[PDB]
């Protein structure tokens, strides 16, 4: 791999530089290189991995949605071709992330924080695949199964206010609403999650109110 | 070239789609392909070419400035290496643009609008090269010579309110201030340009007040 000759610590350092420079493709490539060193990731390093790929795929998703909307309105080959080009690139990034998860990260992750984090990522990237799929049913099932395993662990091992637990619940509720055609399940999940977190605030000394607000924002739109 | 098999009209269409999707690297590659068909560009097509590359290089410039600022504050090899990586990529894009200008576009451009447009672009991309150069003097001279030839044509052939003329003057004034160490020349140019445009408004039936405002913004900062 192109990063094989660079020290792990140097890859991490350069990922952090790339983050400051808003060079997310570079950031992702540095973090992929780091993963491929074969050592587990720390909490901070997992965050760098996630943010990098979330920004790469986010730009591809936004572009895909622009092109798909133009395509749907049109209904020559150019709009479909270019939509397909963006779609293939998006799929490739999702496949790269899922490959890192499968080959390197999920099987070695024993602590609840890391395991839930990676299983959430797996659900997220299957979700992104599902947004463009038409096939679709198997991808949807793969996202659901990853999210559900993460949920089971998070409920057993993490407090209701843990930010990973909260972000997982937020994303799984969006999966229910937008992907799985299950708005009632989405609403139930978001509401139970929010209420249980409210009741656990008392034990605490920013990430989690942020996410709680996002749950409330979705609930406001959905109800 | 990778676009050699695609119709010219399809490349133009896909550049416009890429613009809507904020996919500027794709937009640039489509417009490079179009240029390499060997036909002159229309006014609209020149704008697509410019916007595409301006956005690509703009992201590289912003990242370079972040990394250079970190490097300067530091004064291991990682910050310099990664700054150099971004710098080389930026230089490559500038070289690509300058190559299109030289090989295809400037020699065939006979009308004042197209000639000034392309010579302005040439000055711009030498300017971007000059921002990272340390060498530097020859690049600065190449930018100056391109801008000056464009200026001579624009003053002879275009009215003072023409947006290309205005944008050229704006950029050449920034070259004087930021690159060439000539703030008095920058101020003189911006002020003469603004005043002469004010006096020609009367002949007119958005692009040019925008640029006039940018001239005034710079003058406010400089004086
Ligand atoms: C190194 C800096 C970067 C990568 C920008 O850090 C991103 C952020 O990284 C941490 O925050 C995580 C985190 C985010 C927070 C919700 C951001 O919070 C604020 C207040 O900005 C959003 C990010 O995408 C990130 C890394 C991702 C997840 C998500 C990962 O799923 C696989 C699950 C929820 C959330 C968790 C892991 C957050 O803890 C930190 O706790 C945040 O800082 C604090 C304490 O507020 C920091 O902004
Ligand atoms: C196809 C749409 C895109 C590519 C977004 O169009 C970009 C823009 O293209 C035209 O505007 C040009 C133009 C710009 C205008 C100043 C933008 O005006 C407004 C009101 O947004 C900025 C662009 O970068 C562009 C193409 C570039 C130049 C610059 C090129 O140097 C080599 C010299 C000055 C300026 C000229 C060419 C402008 O005429 C149009 O006249 C603008 O629309 C009008 C009439 O207001 C449109 O937003
Ligand atoms: Cl295409
Ligand atoms: Cl590097
Ligand atoms: Mg625990
Ligand atoms: Mg004329």
Swiss-Prot record, chains A, B:
The keyword Cytoplasm applies. This is 14-3-3 protein sigma. GO terms for molecular function: cadherin binding; identical protein binding; phosphoserine residue binding; protein kinase binding; protein kinase C inhibitor activity; protein sequestering activity. Gene3D superfamilies: 14-3-3 domain. CDD domains: 14-3-3_sigma. The record marks 61, 127 as: Interaction with phosphoserine on interacting protein. Belongs to the 14-3-3 family. Pfam families: 14-3-3. It comes from Homo sapiens (Human). The modification Phosphoserine is found at residue 10. It is found in: Cytoplasm; Nucleus; Secreted. The gene is SFN. Its main location: cytoplasm. The lineage of its organism: Eukaryota, Metazoa, Chordata, Craniata, Vertebrata. GO terms for biological process: cAMP/PKA signal transduction; establishment of skin barrier; intrinsic apoptotic signaling pathway in response to DNA damage; keratinization; keratinocyte development; keratinocyte proliferation; negative regulation of innate immune response; negative regulation of keratinocyte proliferation. Homodimer. Interacts with KRT17 and SAMSN1. Found in a complex with XPO7, EIF4A1, ARHGAP1, VPS26A, VPS29 and VPS35. Interacts with GAB2. Interacts with SRPK2. Interacts with COPS6. Interacts with COP1; this interaction leads to proteasomal degradation. Interacts with the 'Thr-369' phosphorylated form of DAPK2. Interacts with PI4KB. Interacts with SLITRK1. Interacts with LRRK2; this interaction is dependent on LRRK2 phosphorylation. Present mainly in tissues enriched in stratified squamous keratinizing epithelium. Adapter protein implicated in the regulation of a large spectrum of both general and specialized signaling pathways. Binds to a large number of partners, usually by recognition of a phosphoserine or phosphothreonine motif. Binding generally results in the modulation of the activity of the binding partner. Promotes cytosolic retention of GBP1 GTPase by binding to phosphorylated GBP1, thereby inhibiting the innate immune response. Also acts as a TP53/p53-regulated inhibitor of G2/M progression. Ubiquitinated. Ubiquitination by RFFL induces proteasomal degradation and indirectly regulates p53/TP53 activation. The keyword Ubl conjugation applies. It comes from the Eukaryota. One of its GO terms (cellular component) is nucleus. Keywords: Cytoplasm, Nucleus, Phosphoprotein, Secreted, Ubl conjugation.
């Amino acid at each position: 791999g192109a990063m094989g000759s660079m020290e792990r610590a140097s890859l991490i350092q350069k990922a952090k530089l790339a983050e400051q420079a808003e060079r997310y493709e570079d950031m992702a490539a540095f973090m992929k290189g780091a993963v491929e060193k074969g050592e587990e990731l720390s909490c901070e390093e997992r965050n760098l991995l996630s943010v990098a790929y979330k920004n790469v795929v986010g730009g591809q998703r936004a572009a895909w949605r622009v092109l798909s909307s133009i395509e749907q309105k049109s209904n020559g080959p150019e709009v479909r071709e270019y939509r397909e080009k963006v779609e293939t690139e998006l799929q490739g990034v999702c496949d790269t992330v899922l490959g890192l998860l499968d080959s390197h990260l999920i099987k070695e992750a024993g602590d609840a924080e890391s395991r839930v984090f990676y299983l959430k990522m797996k659900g997220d990237y299957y979700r992104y695949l599902a947004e463009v799929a038409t096939d679709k049913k198997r991808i949807i099932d793969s996202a659901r199964s990853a999210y559900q395993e993460a949920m089971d662990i998070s409920k057993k091992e993490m407090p209701p206010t843990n930010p990973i637990r909260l972000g997982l619940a937020l994303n799984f509720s969006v999966f229910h609403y937008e992907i799985a055609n299950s708005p009632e399940e989405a609403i139930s999940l978001a509401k139970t999650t929010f209420d249980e977190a409210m009741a656990d605030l008392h034990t605490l000394s920013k990430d989690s109110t942020l996410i709680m607000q996002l749950l409330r924002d979705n609930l406001t739109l959905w109800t």
